[PDB]
């Protein structure tokens, strides 16, 4: 969805990145909207918790707004080298294509993109791309993971530490299930299948265990 918050967080970025003080009329400018306009959605984006606008009227991303900040940069800088390296798009049409291509691209594109791209390390335009460790290319919880049609992933981590009931140890150390172990999923109890053992986990778990794409 083109967010105009995506946009004016991925403007600081770009600004901080070339040494500019991410200020204000820098950034309407920049984006080609007034300052009223500007002033209008920081104000918003500071209701967000995204972004606190300094005693020096600077702009300073909260640690939030980073994060978008940096994901939205990702997906753009990844999308410009789909568009050089494999479309083969004219170079000079390259970055406001991306400017589109940023609010669209899914985390599950980027990952396949990271996967088919000879090298992720920078932006055909020089500057590295921001975000991959986040990406995952610490882990998608279970919970969150669980897909109502079965699916195949690598355990992150277990988080037995974390546990109070610890009755299922026992059962997924048989169902030989840890992590860096590849197993299936399912929703419904949440059915954690494996070495043809299935481990239906219970709240607590399901919360904890983190399962990498």
Same mark, same amino acid.
């Given at each position: ?6 946009? =004016?967080?991925? %403007?600081? =970025? ?22 009223? %306009? ?108 669980? %897909? ?59 919360? %904890? ?5």
């Amino acid at each position: 969805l083109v967010d105009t918050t995506e946009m =004016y967080l991925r %403007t600081i =970025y770009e600004l901080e990145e070339e040494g500019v003080t991410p200020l204000r009329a820098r950034i309407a400018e920049r984006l080609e909207q007034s300052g009223p %306009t500007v002033s209008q959605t920081v104000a918003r984006m500071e209701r967000d918790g995204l972004v606190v606008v300094a005693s020096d009227r600077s702009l300073q991303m909260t640690p939030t707004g980073r994060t978008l900040a940096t994901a939205v940069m990702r997906k753009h800088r990844l999308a410009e080298r789909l568009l050089t390296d494999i479309i083969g798009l004219d170079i000079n049409k390259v970055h406001d294509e991306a400017c589109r291509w940023e609010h669209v691209m899914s985390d599950e594109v980027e990952r396949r993109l990271v996967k088919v791209l000879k090298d992720v390390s920078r932006s055909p335009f020089g500057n590295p791309i921001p975000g991959l460790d986040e990406l995952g290319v610490p882990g998608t919880r279970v919970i969150d993971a669980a %897909t109502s049609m079965p699916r195949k992933v690598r355990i992150v981590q277990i988080n037995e530490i974390f546990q109070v009931e610890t009755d299922q140890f026992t059962q997924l150390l048989d169902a030989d299930i840890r992590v860096g172990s590849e197993v299936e999923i399912v929703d419904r109890h949440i059915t954690l299948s494996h070495n043809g053992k299935d481990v239906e986990l219970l709240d607590d778990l399901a919360h %904890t265990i983190r399962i990498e794409e």
